[PDB]
Design a protein around this motif. Structure first.
Motif, PDB file in Angstrom:
ATOM      1  N   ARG A 202      34.022  32.074  39.088  1.00 26.82           N
ATOM      2  CA  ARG A 202      35.016  33.086  39.443  1.00 26.82           C
ATOM      3  C   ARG A 202      35.167  34.119  38.324  1.00 26.82           C
ATOM      4  NH1 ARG A 202      39.861  28.556  39.063  1.00 26.82           N
ATOM      5  NH2 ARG A 202      39.027  27.645  37.136  1.00 26.82           N
ATOM      6  N   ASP A 203      34.071  34.824  38.060  1.00 30.42           N
ATOM      7  CA  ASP A 203      34.029  35.874  37.043  1.00 30.42           C
ATOM      8  C   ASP A 203      33.607  37.173  37.717  1.00 30.42           C
ATOM      9  OD1 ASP A 203      34.818  34.187  34.989  1.00 30.42           O
ATOM     10  OD2 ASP A 203      32.754  33.646  34.474  1.00 30.42           O
ATOM     11  N   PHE A 204      34.573  38.060  37.953  1.00 30.00           N
ATOM     12  CA  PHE A 204      34.251  39.348  38.555  1.00 30.00           C
ATOM     13  C   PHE A 204      33.320  40.159  37.669  1.00 30.00           C
ATOM     14  CE2 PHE A 204      35.111  43.856  39.319  1.00 30.00           C
ATOM     15  CZ  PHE A 204      34.803  43.929  40.658  1.00 30.00           C
ATOM     16  N   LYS A 205      33.582  40.172  36.364  1.00 33.01           N
ATOM     17  CA  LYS A 205      32.791  41.000  35.466  1.00 33.01           C
ATOM     18  C   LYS A 205      31.335  40.566  35.455  1.00 33.01           C
ATOM     19  CE  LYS A 205      34.007  43.889  34.154  1.00 33.01           C
ATOM     20  NZ  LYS A 205      34.170  44.115  32.693  1.00 33.01           N
ATOM     21  N   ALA A 206      31.093  39.258  35.378  1.00 28.68           N
ATOM     22  CA  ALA A 206      29.723  38.770  35.284  1.00 28.68           C
ATOM     23  C   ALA A 206      28.914  39.151  36.514  1.00 28.68           C
ATOM     24  CB  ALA A 206      29.722  37.255  35.092  1.00 28.68           C
ATOM     25  N   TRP A 207      29.483  38.960  37.704  1.00 27.48           N
ATOM     26  CA  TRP A 207      28.765  39.308  38.923  1.00 27.48           C
ATOM     27  C   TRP A 207      28.459  40.796  38.957  1.00 27.48           C
ATOM     28  CZ3 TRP A 207      26.060  36.159  41.471  1.00 27.48           C
ATOM     29  CH2 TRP A 207      26.457  34.835  41.682  1.00 27.48           C
TER      30      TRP A 207
ATOM     31  N   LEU B 240      35.805  38.638  44.821  1.00 27.39           N
ATOM     32  CA  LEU B 240      36.658  38.422  43.658  1.00 27.39           C
ATOM     33  C   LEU B 240      37.768  39.464  43.583  1.00 27.39           C
ATOM     34  CD1 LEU B 240      36.256  36.053  41.736  1.00 27.39           C
ATOM     35  CD2 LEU B 240      34.171  36.621  43.006  1.00 27.39           C
ATOM     36  N   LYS B 241      37.417  40.739  43.731  1.00 26.72           N
ATOM     37  CA  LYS B 241      38.377  41.842  43.683  1.00 26.72           C
ATOM     38  C   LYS B 241      38.127  42.763  44.869  1.00 26.72           C
ATOM     39  CE  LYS B 241      40.491  45.179  40.520  1.00 26.72           C
ATOM     40  NZ  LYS B 241      40.646  46.303  41.484  1.00 26.72           N
ATOM     41  N   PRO B 242      38.514  42.337  46.072  1.00 24.65           N
ATOM     42  CA  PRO B 242      38.302  43.193  47.250  1.00 24.65           C
ATOM     43  C   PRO B 242      39.036  44.511  47.153  1.00 24.65           C
ATOM     44  CG  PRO B 242      39.868  41.465  47.755  1.00 24.65           C
ATOM     45  CD  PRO B 242      39.330  41.153  46.388  1.00 24.65           C
ATOM     46  N   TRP B 243      40.125  44.541  46.394  1.00 18.32           N
ATOM     47  CA  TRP B 243      41.023  45.681  46.346  1.00 18.32           C
ATOM     48  C   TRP B 243      40.623  46.684  45.269  1.00 18.32           C
ATOM     49  CZ3 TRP B 243      44.241  46.163  41.969  1.00 18.32           C
ATOM     50  CH2 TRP B 243      44.310  45.048  41.131  1.00 18.32           C
ATOM     51  N   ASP B 244      39.337  47.022  45.198  1.00 16.69           N
ATOM     52  CA  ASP B 244      38.875  48.010  44.233  1.00 16.69           C
ATOM     53  C   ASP B 244      38.015  49.057  44.918  1.00 16.69           C
ATOM     54  OD1 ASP B 244      37.780  49.436  41.981  1.00 16.69           O
ATOM     55  OD2 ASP B 244      38.321  47.688  40.768  1.00 16.69           O
ATOM     56  N   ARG B 245      38.278  50.326  44.602  1.00 22.38           N
ATOM     57  CA  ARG B 245      37.471  51.418  45.138  1.00 22.38           C
ATOM     58  C   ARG B 245      36.079  51.441  44.514  1.00 22.38           C
ATOM     59  NH1 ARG B 245      39.245  54.345  42.140  1.00 22.38           N
ATOM     60  NH2 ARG B 245      37.415  54.856  40.865  1.00 22.38           N
ATOM     61  N   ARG B 246      35.979  51.103  43.226  1.00 19.83           N
ATOM     62  CA  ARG B 246      34.710  51.236  42.515  1.00 19.83           C
ATOM     63  C   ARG B 246      33.639  50.332  43.114  1.00 19.83           C
ATOM     64  NH1 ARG B 246      34.420  51.687  37.905  1.00 19.83           N
ATOM     65  NH2 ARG B 246      32.301  50.932  37.485  1.00 19.83           N
ATOM     66  N   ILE B 247      34.006  49.099  43.463  1.00 18.95           N
ATOM     67  CA  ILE B 247      33.021  48.166  43.994  1.00 18.95           C
ATOM     68  C   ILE B 247      32.570  48.596  45.381  1.00 18.95           C
ATOM     69  CG2 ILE B 247      34.878  46.631  44.795  1.00 18.95           C
ATOM     70  CD1 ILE B 247      32.883  44.315  44.157  1.00 18.95           C
TER      71      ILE B 247
END
Lengths: 658, 96, 75, 250
Positions: free
Chosen positions: D212-217, D243-250
């Protein structure tokens, strides 16, 4: 014998066991010469480097021409069982057992190693003949044992005192594991152990004072359990080198893919990696992947594949990114995803161009048709037509190909058969592929050799000579299947032949139940047609022809547009012919039968020509003009008995005429 | 890998008819000096995979004389203004 | 024609007929999920510990396809 | 309390145990002094709320009123302010956090406990001149803390010496293996060295230590994306979406 596993770049306790054996053999004082088969089973796995690509290449060099015993796990219990078998192996077995008892200290370990380098190992042969004054056999560096012992010598001078202590702490752990074993009880007392132990224990230089307290150093460290033991870091139960792990893994996957092995011990030990050796040994990931496919786990297959291709690419300097997709493409084609596999493959082409390397393009092209061979319905979707490849690979080069031309012609043969070309060309094209495949080693190229058998069996079966097919089918391997085509396909294929036999023996209940599985299974195209062909035959036997007639035409109509399979078109057409004439109206089929007769007369396939003759005979006898039917069948009776499976129909028609 | 020429037949017919950059891995990078290891020979690259045992074998071989070759060059005792590196070069000329 | 499995807070949706896999998250924990024509109905986890407390204002979530935002029921 | 923190894994279990501390939990009033055994007037029950609900980023409850209660009792506590500063950092509120940390440096100049976030902020900030202030100052204290080897790595990275800055990150991880955040930073400096192969395994270890590491993925997805493997990267990016569905960047 189980325990935690850890990769060690130092002298594993297993390694010393060979060094134990080589010491006795070279010393020639006991007159004990270890059999050559023993060494070749022990040292050879430690020999470095084999490599094994995940997919896209099967046993292209891994298969040994001579069947070899499985590699041995690093446990005294397994090692002793090798020597124990011989009637005099007890003498050799006790020799190892005694030496392990004599070696009670780290110094004693050093005495063994100093002995070999100074006396046993020697730089070169030119000093063999001058050293005739040696009472012990001397070793050359370049020899099989010589190169091994050199590596072992290197791995001992490579480390500080920190590594030497780990050797002795582990060996005593390793030795004591064998102690609480039933076999050790069988060897509790053997008198010969004391004799051999005292042979090397001599010249101790002290027996009265130091030996009183030498024991105290050994015992205090050891778990006497009289008090709380001295606390020490957790130590691994088994130590293996990377190369030794390579051999055991490769043998296990090959054995799994298609002298007894210990699957449980290997699997249990492989589950205790510190996750860092897994980085040093990426092949542990794929060992789960092959296991994953066996039970058909989707996500668990995927992550393992991604796991394997991340550590491998970084470790190897050459770009293998162009190889990762193909394996992933194979994996998707393994689960009949097909369309997703298509997208995966396209970006592999682009990557190959940027590397600007020619040799990989041959690999990417060869994968194309292999994929399209399994799924011929996708030929139009590729950016290169199949015929372009064959023209390209036929004139690819004259050297550095080896297997490409063998691959090239088989694709032409398959296409030539499907394109229902004249038998003269098909025979020639198969001839080319047969000659080139057998000319090189066929045993090593196991995949293509099986494919040759399948084509030849299919080819001659279409001509109607089961006698030839019978010889070749004995060479066809069952349950072997092939890569990139599922894992239960062999089970399905075996089941279909059961259903066809069940249909012949009028076992309508079994075949009926199987068709229920048909509509909800994921099947290969070649399998799909057979079941599709199976259903229409079953419906004929039941008697309902309104459903089958609407069903057969849809099949053949889609057997000419989606896939240009002429052979399956023929088999479907004659079934419709059977349906009509069976319903007392075969006259409608007269235009259809005739247009095929003259068409196949030019082709010259006798089996095709004869089968239509019988249908033509059958329609003429349900008219009331059996007189001329008898005249026609009389003239051609000679040439229609050559085909076996039509004889039953041919014979049955004869009593009808009487 | 017969290359179609190791085949005796086709090789016979041909006669009649005639009438790698290296990149470091993680394990290559060590902790003390930020320069990555550069393998000396292609033998140390095992099918492109850097064998860790051969890497550390060369590393040990490099450091072992380094203790012996210490006193060379910069170090100078007091009362002798001339370091030992040229003690042997004059010694070499003495006999020669 | 997709097969969906619902975890405590995460749903995995695997294409079976054609396509790959998708995964979606949820604003809060889910007690149970019930299938309905073109979507799923998700009921919030009521209580866990042994105190027993629960919400009643809104505990049901409607989703049609994984990519589109969720919807709220009406009673 | 820490060793009880590390055993916790998910927010639902945090609620599971939080109730247990309330209904069927009581202290031995004999050993503890009076007016203290009460759970409502305890302290590390309060300190409990501040740490676990935010380190795991769980749903906050009974969290506010405890927070200002601790500010009143502990106005000079260095650990509280850094955590309070950390909260602003965790909410991507960097201007306010910089002010918060600046009190720590002036009040407590020698604290290699939470300054890893400070240098992390300053790298985003730029002002290499200010960063060079810290690297010289922090390294002067000692070079064996996990942070002091990541403080300097940032300063070396900002000056485009990756081949040196890459080494310090490995040094920083070696001292304390629990600082998994250095792994992603490890991989980034590989990317700027145009050695994609070395990079991919790097992010890969980061997600083996904890999935559960957003940064690593995300960092691993990019490395394939820099290469023409647009699709071979779809999986990694897809995994990061959960991990972070609520991001525009991804």
């Amino acid at each position: 014998k189980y325990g935690p596993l850890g990769i060690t770049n130092f002298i594993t306790p297993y390694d010393l066991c060979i060094l134990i054996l080589i010491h006795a053999h070279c010393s020639q004082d006991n007159g004990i010469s270890v059999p050559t088969a023993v060494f070749l089973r022990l040292i050879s796995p430690t020999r470095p480097s084999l490599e094994w690509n995940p997919l896209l290449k099967d046993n292209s060099n891994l298969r040994s021409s001579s069947i070899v015993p499985p590699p041995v796990l690093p446990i005294l219990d397994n090692i002793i069982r090798i020597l124990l078998d011989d009637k005099d192996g007890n003498k050799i077995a006790l020799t190892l057992m005694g030496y392990l008892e004599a070696i009670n200290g780290l110094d004693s370990i050093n005495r063994l190693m100093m002995d070999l380098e100074k006396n046993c190992l020697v730089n070169n042969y030119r000093s063999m003949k001058m050293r005739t004054t040696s009472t012990r056999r001397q070793m050359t560096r370049a020899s099989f044992l010589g190169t091994f012992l050199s590596t072992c010598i290197r791995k001992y001078q490579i480390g500080d005192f920190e590594m030497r202590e780990t050797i002795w702490i582990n060996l005593q752990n390793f030795k004591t594991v064998f102690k609480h074993t039933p076999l050790w009880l069988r060897f509790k007392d053997n008198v010969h152990i004391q004799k051999v132990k005292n042979c090397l224990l001599a010249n101790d230089e002290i027996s009265v004072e130091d030996q009183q307290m030498v024991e105290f150093f050994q015992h205090f460290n050891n778990g006497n359990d009289a008090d709380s033991k001295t606390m020490n870091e957790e130590n691994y139960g088994t130590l293996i080198s990377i190369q030794h792990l390579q051999s055991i893994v490769n043998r296990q996957i090959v054995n799994w893919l298609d002298y007894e092995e210990q699957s449980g011990l290997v699997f249990d030990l492989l589950d205790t990696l510190s996750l860092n050796d897994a980085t040093k040994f990426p092949l542990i990931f794929i060992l789960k992947y092959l296991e994953a496919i066996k039970e058909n786990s989707y996500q668990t297959a995927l992550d393992s594949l991604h796991n394997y291709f991340d550590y491998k690419s970084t470790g190897n300097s050459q770009n293998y990114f162009h190889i990762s997709l193909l394996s992933l493409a194979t994996f998707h084609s393994s689960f009949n995803e097909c369309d997703a596999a298509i997208n995966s493959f396209e970006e592999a082409t682009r990557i190959a161009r940027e590397n600007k390397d020619m040799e990989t393009l041959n690999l990417i092209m060869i994968w194309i048709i292999n994929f399209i061979e399994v799924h011929p319905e996708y030929a139009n979707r590729f950016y290169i037509t199949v015929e372009q490849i064959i023209k390209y690979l036929k004139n690819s080069s004259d050297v550095e190909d080896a297997n490409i031309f063998s691959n090239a012609y088989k694709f032409e043969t398959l296409l030539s058969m499907v394109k229902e070309s004249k038998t003269a060309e098909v025979s020639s094209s198969l001839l080319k592929f047969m000659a080139i495949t057998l000319q090189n080693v066929p045993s090593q190229n196991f995949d293509l050799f099986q494919s040759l058998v399948s084509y030849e069996v299919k080819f001659w079966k279409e001509l109607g000579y089961e006698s030839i097919s019978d010889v070749y089918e004995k060479f066809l391997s069952k349950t072997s299947s092939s890569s990139l085509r599922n894992y239960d396909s062999s089970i399905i294929n075996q089941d279909i032949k059961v259903a066809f036999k069940a249909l012949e023996e009028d076992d309508f209940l079994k075949v009926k139940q199987y068709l229920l599985k048909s509509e909800s299974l994921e099947l290969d195209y070649d399998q799909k047609i057979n079941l599709k062909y199976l259903r229409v035959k079953y419906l004929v036997k039941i008697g309902d022809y309104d459903l089958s007639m609407r069903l057969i035409n849809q099949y053949v109509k889609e057997c000419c547009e989606e896939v240009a399979d002429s052979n399956w078109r023929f088999k479907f057409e004659i079934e419709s012919i059977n349906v009509l004439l069976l319903s007392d109206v075969g006259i409608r089929s007269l235009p259809k039968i005739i247009k095929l007769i003259d068409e196949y007369k030019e082709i010259g396939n006798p089996l095709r020509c004869v089968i239509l003759l019988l249908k033509l005979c059958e329609v003429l006898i349900q008219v009331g003009k059996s007189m001329e039917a008898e005249c026609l069948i009389s003239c051609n009776l000679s040439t229609i008995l050559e085909f076996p499976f039509v004889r039953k129909k041919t014979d049955e028609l004869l009593e009808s005429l009487s | 890998a017969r290359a179609l020429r190791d085949i005796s037949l086709f090789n016979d017919i041909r006669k009649d008819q005639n009438s790698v950059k290296y990149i470091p891995s993680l394990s290559a990078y060590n902790v003390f000096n930020e320069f990555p290891y550069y393998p000396t020979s292609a033998s140390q690259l095992l099918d492109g995979k850097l064998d860790e045992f051969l890497m550390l074998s060369e590393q040990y071989k490099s450091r072992l004389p380094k203790i012996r070759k210490l006193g060379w060059n910069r170090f100078k005792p007091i009362g002798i203004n001339k370091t030992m590196y040229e003690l042997e070069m004059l010694r070499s000329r003495a006999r020669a | 024609d997709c097969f969906v499995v619902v975890l405590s807070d995460i749903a995995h949706v695997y294409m079976l007929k054609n396509g790959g896999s998708t995964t979606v998250c949820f604003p809060f924990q889910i007690g149970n999920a019930f299938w309905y024509a073109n979507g799923v109905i998700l009921e919030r986890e009521t209580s866990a510990s042994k105190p027993i407390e629960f919400d009643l204002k809104h505990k049901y979530i409607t989703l049609t396809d994984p990519m589109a935002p969720f919807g709220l029921i009406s009673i | 309390w820490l060793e009880l923190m590390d055993c916790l894994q998910k927010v639902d279990d945090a609620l599971l145990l939080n109730n247990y501390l309330y209904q069927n939990f009581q202290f031995k009033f004999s050993e503890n002094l009076g007016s203290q055994r009460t759970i409502e007037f305890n302290i590390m029950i309060k300190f409990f709320k501040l740490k676990v609900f935010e380190e795991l980023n769980g749903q906050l409850e009974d969290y506010f009123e405890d927070l200002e209660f601790l500010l009143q009792v502990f106005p000079n506590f260095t650990f509280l302010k850094a955590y309070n500063a950390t909260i602003s950092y965790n909410n991507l509120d960097y201007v306010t956090a910089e002010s918060r940390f600046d009190d720590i440096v002036k009040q407590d100049p020698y604290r290699l406990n939470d300054l890893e976030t400070y240098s992390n902020i300053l790298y985003v900030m730029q002002k290499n001149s200010k960063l060079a202030y810290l690297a010289q100052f922090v390294s002067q204290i000692d070079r064996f803390r996990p942070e002091t080897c990541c403080i300097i790595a940032n300063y070396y990275s900002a000056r485009q010496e990756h081949e040196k800055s890459i080494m310090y990150f490995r040094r920083a991880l070696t001292l304390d293996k629990k600082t998994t955040n250095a792994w992603t930073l490890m991989g980034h400096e590989f990317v700027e060295l145009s050695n994609s192969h070395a990079a991919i395994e790097c992010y890969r270890r980061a997600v083996d230590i904890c999935p559960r590491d957003f940064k690593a993925w995300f960092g691993l997805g990019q490395a394939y994306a820099l290469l023409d493997m647009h699709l071979y990267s779809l999986y990694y990016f897809q995994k990061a979406c959960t991990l972070k569905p609520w991001d525009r960047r991804i």
